[PDB]
Amino acid sequence: MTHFSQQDNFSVAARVLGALFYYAPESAEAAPLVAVLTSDGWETQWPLPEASLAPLVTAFQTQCEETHAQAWQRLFVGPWALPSPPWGSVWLDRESVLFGDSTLALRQWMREKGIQFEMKQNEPEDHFGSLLLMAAWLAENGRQTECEELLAWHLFPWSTRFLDVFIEKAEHPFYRALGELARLTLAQWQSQLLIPVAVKPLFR
Incomplete structure (x- = not known):
């Protein structure tokens, strides 16, 4: 009866994922979240089964030679082409441009x-x-x-594809792990929807 957006830490989980994909790991926004996921305890509060997060708990704390900041720059900023561009119209627009027809619909x-x-x-x-x-x-x-329309019509039609390529191209234990957490969590949210996800053709 209570809507899924109003329980089981939806808003909390969506902010952690959202922030780590949008802000640099050394930022005031992301650094505390990097610390949380690279430490024990976060799995108990996250809205997925604890045993199914166990590999991610280990994955997030896997040490790497490339720093979080170098990985983030490479994946989200530039200067060169990004392996999995995090903008929706890159995936939904025939010409794969930014500020696309799907961006306008949003x-x-x-x-x-x-x-x-x-x-x-x-x-x-x-x-x-x-x-x-x-x-x-x-x-x-x-x-x-x-909240439901946002996810069903404007995020979920393309986000699974973005995450599939992002997880494949992350090449950094922390950010690969973040991708897999996002895929699991969003797939769980998709199953709780009371309206279907908009089916749209992908061009990337």
């Missing part, structure tokens, strides 16, 4: 629903981490339907 939906959540200036709204942060934002605000 923008119009936000407008109609009077959602005042704004991204950084010059940034598209369809960043993977941004959308999770917005979803947590709506959940905190009790906006159940909007």
Whole structure:
């Protein structure tokens, strides 16, 4: 009876995932989250079965020669091409551009629903981490339907594909592990949906 966005740490889990995909690991936003996931205890509070997180607990604490910051820069910033670009219209748009037709559909939906959540200036709204942060934002605000529509229509149609390629191309134990946690967690959320995920063709 209680909506899944309002229980079992939905907003909490969506923020951790959202922040680690959007902010650099040394940042004020992400560093405390990096510390949490690289330490014992986080598995007890995360909304998945503890035994099924056990490999991730170990994975996150696997030591590596490449630093978290170097991995993050390589994967999310540049200067060279990103292995798995975290913007939705890269996956949903025929021409695979940023600020695509799917980005516009997201923008119009936000407008109609009077959602005042704004991204950084010059940034598209369809960043993977941004959308999770917005979803947590709506959940905190009790906006159940909007949270459900966000995920079903604007995130889940492309996020599984992005995560499949991202996990494959992470090449860093921490960020590979983050990808797998995101895939499991979002797949669990997808199964709790009361409206179906929008089926859209992928071009990447």
